[PDB]
Point group: C3
Chain length 259, copies 3
């Protein structure tokens, strides 16, 4: 329940009694911080921030700061929604939404390495890793268990599928498909994120069905449109594969070129 005396916390900020705030941190008004959340030193939590339970914010992390959008109205009250059990490492930088009804949303059990960045209006699910120095532009969506490696940049309006991986230094300009590994500049889909599926304990049967789905899509000499139709006409598919199909059809920017 210990808070450092040299912390500047607004009277109105709704901090749970268990919460810890370190030296020279600054918490603004219109802030909710729930149970078990530990804040270190020099952390800034900006107005609009709704932080859940058992999160950690390491030194210099900056939460709910202004959108890096030159057309954004700074007098607006916009939000940063953060779930439970997230870790924000040193100088990680999370920006709030650009509209009253579009917050920046982070789920549970995500890990933001030092100096990593989440732009305005990003939506992240659960158990994601954003590695050191990686930057998401505004309006980037991650599903669950995505691994984004160091110094990656993700273009605005891209989706990153569940259990996908993006290697160091990759320039992502289109969607990263589920269960897949993306790499390079220009980046391409390399193949399956097998290591991630195994780590996640996917049965060999599911992993093979995911493999067959992408064999059809990417390794059968037919267009993506025809490949998706073939998969469906094939009969009853597992939900992972239905998810792959949906992901391809709903894609806004399109899906990263295959290598």
């Amino acid at each position: 329940m210990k808070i450092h005396p040299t912390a500047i916390i607004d009277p109105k900020a709704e901090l749970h009694e268990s919460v810890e705030v370190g030296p020279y941190s600054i918490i603004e008004g219109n802030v909710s911080i729930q149970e078990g959340t530990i804040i270190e030193g020099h952390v800034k939590i900006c107005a609009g921030s709704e932080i859940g339970k058992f999160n950690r914010f390491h030194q210099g992390a900056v939460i709910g700061v202004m959108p890096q959008d030159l057309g954004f109205n700074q007098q607006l009250l916009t939000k940063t929604v953060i779930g439970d059990h997230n870790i924000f490492r040193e100088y990680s930088n999370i920006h709030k939404g650009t509209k009253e009804d579009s917050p920046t949303v982070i789920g549970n059990k995500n890990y933001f390495m030092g100096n990593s960045h989440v732009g305005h209006d990003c939506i992240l699910g659960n158990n994601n890793i954003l590695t050191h120095g990686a930057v998401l532009a505004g309006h980037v969506t991650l599903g669950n268990f995505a691994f984004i490696s160091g110094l990656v940049a993700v273009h605005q309006f891209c989706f990153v599928g569940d259990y996908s991986m993006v290697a160091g230094l990759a320039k992502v300009v289109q969607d990263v498909p589920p269960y897949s590994t993306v790499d390079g500049n220009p980046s391409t889909v390399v193949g399956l994120n097998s290591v991630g599926m195994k780590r996640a304990g996917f049965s060999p049967e599911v992993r093979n069905a995911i493999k067959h789905a992408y064999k059809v899509i990417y390794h059968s000499g037919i267009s993506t449109r025809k490949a998706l139709d073939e998969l469906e006409a094939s009969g009853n598919l597992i939900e992972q594969v239905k998810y792959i199909i949906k992901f391809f059809r709903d894609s806004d920017r399109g899906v990263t070129n295959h290598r």
Copy 2:
């Protein structure tokens, strides 16, 4: 006119009366800060810094710090010259000059996104954008309205032309030509920065003349030297095109290869 009590500001620092300095910021001696400039928390403004009007320095921004030059004499009094209406985002990092008569110069209406870096002796004009995590080496020159995307690195002694764009993750080793888009590792000129010229309200006539100039240079099967001569012998050219020609001739490192 409000300054936070926990700020360490040198008595000699020349701050205007309107200026605002946030919690735990450190301003040194030999600092001039003009009217309307707002400084947030944990900002450091180093000796030699001449800051203009209506600038903003977000949390943790570091201004006029020592050159990352191992041969530089730290006892020297060198400057960081910053104009009006500039925005320096969280943990952005601006380094001072390496000589008494060569300051680091930033003009007006520039935007430095979080964790972006301007090396010693850089010269930047007006209305430029330095996107998140981007780094300019020492002695980098930007004109006006250059857009430099996220996690770009620019080599020392490169020039970046007006209304040019550099995409994520590009490794810039030679000049970025005016009105052009550069991308990749190794980077190349992709084509015209049409989006930027339109946004800037260039007439179709000017945009087409810029297009014709580069068609000759890059798309007519002739050497750059011959292409520039052809353009001039063509008669009276618009000033944008004369600027393109001058930019190519005055280039020190040469101009980025075309794709």
Copy 3:
């Protein structure tokens, strides 16, 4: 001998009397800082940190922070060993070891530019340069006089040889061989780091023997295995060349592909 009043330093921390600690810095218990070491503002030195003589830690540098390893036990007492005459620039980030008997080790006369990162269990020798925004993963080893340029990422378990260079933006996934230059994504060995060998004052005879060694390895139409055997059967070799041979044989991940 001057320490700022607003610094939070643990009573148990073993700081030499000459040491300087700037405003709003935080030093923890179980910290040794030797003679002549200057710390600026907002620097954090974490438990386990053994800092030598005449080092400098610029504003916001974070030393001995927790490993970015999700399987690491945070209750463990692990170390960060730093030698003499090192410079850590603004917001540079050094992480401690993951085991009691495996510290993170930095030698002497190294330079860590702003926002550069050394992951858990890295071993660095002397006179190395880690340029702005560059990131080393955990278990990265650098020898002596390695120059690592801006925004480079180095994969876990890679070795970087003496007097080697890695250009901006390079994605390093295998070893960087001694006296060599590595570049790109995917990165390759470009050739010899001649500039670095000359700067270091290598005689033309040694530089030529290094050149001949790599000519055999990389420019004689024979496998690396055969090339190394040929070099040895050639007779008495200089120690630089023996070092090249050893480096290739002892390599864990293998050595970066040649261009």
